[PDB]
């Protein structure tokens with residue numbers, strides 16, 4: 001039998017009740033340049049089963065407790081055993097307290113410790129954040145516990161089901177502000193040993209998980225609103241940022257989103273206030289800490305003057321996401337990280353609902369399809385994918401836990417929950433969801449608990465009927481990886497399902513308890529009229545007249561792509577669909593217009609339709625005003641561009657794309673009053689951004705003209721940028737393309753003086769669009785200079801250049817030549833050799849190019865490849881695929897484009 005301090009999961013012998021935790025960061029270094037924080041904690045816990053050892057999480061903390069590493073006391077009149085010895089076991093991250101006797105079932109104990117650790121800038125635990133205000137470097141203190149870093153700030157039972165109440169005290173310079181999950185008890189008070197310091201006590205938290213704790217000490221200020229129930233809402237940011245009003249949009253949306261979720265969930269927001277704080281260079285993105293949610297600045301702040309509409313959308317959706325957790329994930333918490341998908345899938349879905357409430361004219365719910373469904377299907381249509389569910393006994397180590405945080409868990413999770421909601425109807429879903437939340441408030445659950453509660457709601461009504469239990473249907477979507485392609489022969493109304501894989505020649509080696517069969521809910525539209533809902537059972541083949549058609553008829557499946565599957569037809573129904581789109585497109589719902597494109601290209605990739613059938617599905621676009629179907633096309637074709645932009649196929653492609661996009665370009669020229677006012681709603685704003693982008697980048701002269709006109713106008717008046725943030729990336733890029741060192745230098749200047757991150761990113765990317773070799777080689781020379789380009793931007797700037805077809809060879813040489821900079825960039829800052837390699841080898845589609853790549857790998861002789869070690873293997877295997885795809889496709893593709901370019 002093995003020793004419990006060597007097992008990654010905690011015993012169940014001791015459960016915490018409550019914690020006192022006092023943290024004191026020292027924001028001035030110790031002259032050796034070390035910053036530290038000091039702590040003291042007391043954890044009260046209960047004995048469940050007899051035991052003569054206390055195992056508790058601890059990570060990179062030194063103890064300065066008097067005596068042993070902890071002091072142990074009994075609560076009330078409980079006696080307590082003497083401590084034998086206390087040790088730290090680093091591998092499993094434990095403080096282990098061996099006792100001279102056993103604790104007693106039903107007895108409560110208090111364990112006190114004093115400790116300190118590094119206040120590193122590592123974005124982990126209690127950690128520091130350095131940033132610039134004027135001539136001053138500022139340092140603040142803040143936390144990121146997710147997922148196994150609470151133990152890095154204070155010793156605790158750091159598993160998510162092991163909830164307790166937390167009383168937090170912060171000791172801090174007296175002119176700084178102290179924040180935590182809960183409001184402060186009253187006014188800060190001076191620290192008696194040194195009144196330069198203050199003491200802020202916070203109210204007791206609700207029963208909660210250690211990973212949701214947060215405490216922050218900074219100079220930050222806030223904008224406030226008291227919602228009507230009394231809930232204080234603040235937005236915290238850098239003083240300068242607050243003073244520019246960049247916190248306003250977040251303040252505008254937060255109250256609304258909160259009220260929405262409180263109703264949607266049928267459950268009060270469980271806290272007295274909600275803080276949201278914008279942190280500079282928070283690489284985690286955002287973190288749903290209960291009552292104190294942290295965001296990277298670009299994610300929470302918004303400047304109306306410079307930010308685009310897609311920035312606004314990012315702000316509102318990110319808030320909606322984190323706010324969604326305040327109930328789902330925080331109030332009711334998954335018992336273990338194997339069910340992460342539930343929590344994050346759920347928030348990934350309801351973010352759309354929350355944001356839609358705040359911005360009801362935008363139609364945000366639509367964006368889940370391009371943004372999550374098709375995104376995740378690209379990786380879920382692979383042999384190397386994995387189930388939503390993972391057995392709990394296979395997730396044990398911090399790194400195994402971190403692996404749970406991926407595209408499957410977020411995006412498929414959102415996609416399957418969205419499907420669940422649609423086949424139940426939202427009202428029914430909400431009923432079960434309210435029931436789950438009430439039954440499990442302040443406790444922990446598994447996905448089976450949600451199913452059980454949704455089943456309860458189903459069982460209590462008569463309108464919605466199901467082929468099977470919620471569980472049994474959901475098990476097909478959660479226990480096995482992948483999804484089905486649904487093929488229909490409209491001639492007969494026969495309908496099949498198979499495990500879909502983009503590579504038709506791939507060996508699936510992961511077995512399923514269901515033989516890759518799903519219970520599939522299928523909506524469907526015939527002649528623009530909604531048909532009866534159908535359910536495909538767990539069978540390969542079936543028939544229903546719902547999918548039988550006539551000569552003049554067409555049938556389309558999966559309305560609004562609510563189902564997690566792709567649809568293929570017979571050629572005739574396909575052609576008929578096409579005719580409808582040529583003649584009256586408004587009869588096919590705008591999401592399915594997109595679906596036709598999305599699925600067809602994937603099916604072509606899988607060899608289930610010819611590539612010409614997919615291309616035919618773009619033909620209708622010349623009359624399409626709407627964002628999504630265009631976006632589907634632009635997404636599906638970016639790879640054709642990447643393969644053919646250096647070949648005889650390109651000219652035809654561009655000619656074609658010009659043809660398709662011009663009418664749309666014209667339409668906006670009209671509708672925007674010669675580009676003087678943006679369209680009204682989000683979707684139309686996106687469509688315009690896409691058309692202009694496409695028009696210019698395929699060389700539509702009217703687009704080129706505009707781009708040159710506006711940039712001329714800007715250079716004549718630098719302080720008054722005429723270009724609307726929405727169009728900056730296109731206009732900037734095209735203009736620099738049409739220009740020389742005049743345009744490039746101006747832009748570069750603008751970059752060096754640009755205050756706001758997004759504007760800098762747009763100039764940095766545009767600068768890569770010069771068509772001059774000397775200008776792109778000069779600019780590469782700049783990427784390895786920190787005074788000119790931030791290290792954290794270098795590999796990205798290199799990829800932008802390689803994106804330019806003129807820049808492809810220049811970038812590829814730069815990289816091979818400077819590969820002697822793995823041993824300069826591996827110690828100071830990661831650098832991400834993985835991203836750089838993948839981006840620069842992206843185009844490689846020929847035998848010759850492959851020999852070059854092999855020949856480059858022959859520098860194997862040390863220097864290695866670092867964090868891109870075997871991201872070079874992926875690049876070799878990706879070129880082989882490209883060569884093989886280009887041989888099979890070149891001819892057919894070329895002919896089609898010529899055929900259709902007028």
Ligand SMILES: *[C@@H]1O[C@H](CO)[C@@H](O[C@@H]2O[C@H](CO)[C@@H](O[C@@H]3O[C@H](CO)[C@@H](O)[C@H](O)[C@H]3NC(C)=O)[C@H](O)[C@H]2NC(C)=O)[C@H](O)[C@H]1NC(C)=O
Pocket residue numbers: 020042044110167
């Ligand atoms: C976790 O933190 C709690 C808050 O600090 C502790 O509870 C506090 O204990 C204090 C003393 O230990 C009490 O303050 C005063 O102390 C003087 C001693 O000189 C006493 O006479 C008074 O009873 C008391 N003052 C008043 C106005 O009653 C606090 O009463 C008390 N604060 C509370 C309960 O909110 C917990 O003890 C601490 N937990 C553990 C396990 O140590």
Ligand SMILES: *[C@@H]1O[C@H](CO)[C@@H](O[C@@H]2O[C@H](CO)[C@@H](O[C@@H]3O[C@H](CO)[C@@H](O)[C@H](O)[C@H]3NC(C)=O)[C@H](O)[C@H]2NC(C)=O)[C@H](O)[C@H]1NC(C)=O
Pocket residue numbers: 032036037062116117118119
């Ligand atoms: C928690 O305890 C750790 C172990 O006590 C501390 O880590 C130790 O830090 C020492 C200095 O910071 C290192 O020793 C040497 O220190 C002298 C004088 O400061 C230097 O000249 C030497 O360069 C240095 N030795 C070397 C080989 O570089 C210890 O090596 C080091 N031990 C480790 C890292 O295991 C932590 O400082 C302490 N942390 C906190 C936050 O209190």
Ligand SMILES: *[C@@H]1O[C@H](CO)[C@@H](O[C@@H]2O[C@H](CO)[C@@H](O[C@@H]3O[C@H](CO)[C@@H](O)[C@H](O)[C@H]3NC(C)=O)[C@H](O)[C@H]2NC(C)=O)[C@H](O)[C@H]1NC(C)=O
Pocket residue numbers: 248249252304
């Ligand atoms: C947070 O919510 C506020 C309340 O809805 C928004 O305030 C509105 O901002 C609009 C756009 O900035 C203003 O519209 C126009 O602004 C121009 C430019 O100054 C004026 O000339 C026009 O008179 C005005 N009205 C028009 C075109 O009809 C609104 O006036 C203003 N509304 C209120 C009640 O103040 C905030 O914009 C919003 N903040 C953010 C960052 O989105």
Ligand SMILES: *[C@@H]1O[C@H](CO)[C@@H](O[C@@H]2O[C@H](CO)[C@@H](O)[C@H](O)[C@H]2NC(C)=O)[C@H](O)[C@H]1NC(C)=O
Pocket residue numbers: 018019020042043044165166167204
């Ligand atoms: C954290 O603070 C809370 C709030 O005061 C403490 O809650 C009290 O716990 C004591 C000791 O069990 C009880 O006598 C009181 O009934 C509780 N008060 C309230 C208002 O709930 C809690 O004990 C503190 N935690 C720790 C570790 O001391």
Ligand SMILES: *[C@@H]1O[C@H](CO)[C@@H](O[C@@H]2O[C@H](CO)[C@@H](O)[C@H](O)[C@H]2NC(C)=O)[C@H](O)[C@H]1NC(C)=O
Pocket residue numbers: 028136175176219
């Ligand atoms: C809070 O107090 C500290 C200590 O005085 C201030 O820190 C100094 O700020 C000045 C700028 O006015 C700098 O020139 C110094 O280098 C800082 N000193 C140290 C030791 O860090 C700080 O500015 C004050 N902050 C607020 C918000 O009032």
Ligand SMILES: *[C@@H]1O[C@H](CO)[C@@H](O[C@@H]2O[C@H](CO)[C@@H](O)[C@H](O)[C@H]2NC(C)=O)[C@H](O)[C@H]1NC(C)=O
Pocket residue numbers: 262263265266267268
């Ligand atoms: C949760 O939902 C219930 C049921 O919808 C809410 O109670 C209803 O509120 C309306 C208010 O006009 C009444 O007319 C209904 O008859 C109520 N139903 C019941 C069963 O009481 C309830 O208020 C919601 N709670 C929260 C916290 O949002």
Ligand SMILES: *[C@@H]1O[C@H](CO)[C@@H](O[C@@H]2O[C@H](CO)[C@@H](O)[C@H](O)[C@H]2NC(C)=O)[C@H](O)[C@H]1NC(C)=O
Pocket residue numbers: 015161162163335440443444445
């Ligand atoms: C994790 O969650 C379960 C519930 O899913 C908790 O078990 C419940 O505990 C409460 C209060 O102690 C009781 O009312 C119920 O009888 C329990 N339900 C069960 C066992 O199904 C459990 O305590 C939580 N685990 C931890 C470690 O807090």
Ligand SMILES: *[C@@H]1O[C@H](CO)[C@@H](O[C@@H]2O[C@H](CO)[C@@H](O)[C@H](O)[C@H]2NC(C)=O)[C@H](O)[C@H]1NC(C)=O
Pocket residue numbers: 489492494541543
């Ligand atoms: C549609 O499905 C039906 C049956 O589910 C298929 O028809 C059968 O095909 C077998 C194969 O040899 C024949 O022996 C049977 O006599 C047929 N059954 C009938 C007509 O009831 C039919 O081929 C399918 N259509 C397709 C795939 O297009």
Ligand SMILES: *[C@@H]1O[C@H](CO)[C@@H](O[C@@H]2O[C@H](CO)[C@@H](O)[C@H](O)[C@H]2NC(C)=O)[C@H](O)[C@H]1NC(C)=O
Pocket residue numbers: 366530559560589590591
């Ligand atoms: C498919 O999705 C569209 C959105 O693209 C749905 O249309 C929306 O429906 C709601 C309620 O009817 C309205 O409040 C929105 O304003 C509608 N928008 C548009 C553009 O019509 C449509 O109802 C969905 N159809 C089905 C069958 O689910």
Ligand SMILES: CC(C)C[C@H](NC(=O)[C@@H](O)[C@H](N)Cc1ccccc1)C(=O)O
Pocket residue numbers: 146147284285286287288317318321322325344405410
């Ligand atoms: C809208 C979301 C996808 C935003 C997202 N944030 C989250 O998922 C949070 O709710 C996560 N729970 C926090 C997190 C993120 C990354 C790594 C570790 C921990 C992120 O930007 O990473």
Ligand SMILES: *[C@@H]1O[C@H](CO)[C@@H](O)[C@H](O)[C@H]1NC(C)=O
Pocket residue numbers: 505506507
């Ligand atoms: C997979 O197995 C098949 C035969 O079942 C074989 O022809 C093929 O080479 C294998 N691998 C790949 C990657 O196609």
Ligand SMILES: *[C@@H]1O[C@H](CO)[C@@H](O)[C@H](O)[C@H]1NC(C)=O
Pocket residue numbers: 584586587
């Ligand atoms: C085409 O279909 C739309 C959408 O239903 C309908 O409103 C319109 O009357 C039709 N227009 C034409 C020109 O046939």
Ligand SMILES: [Zn+2]
Pocket residue numbers: 288321322325343344347
């Ligand atoms: Zn999340």
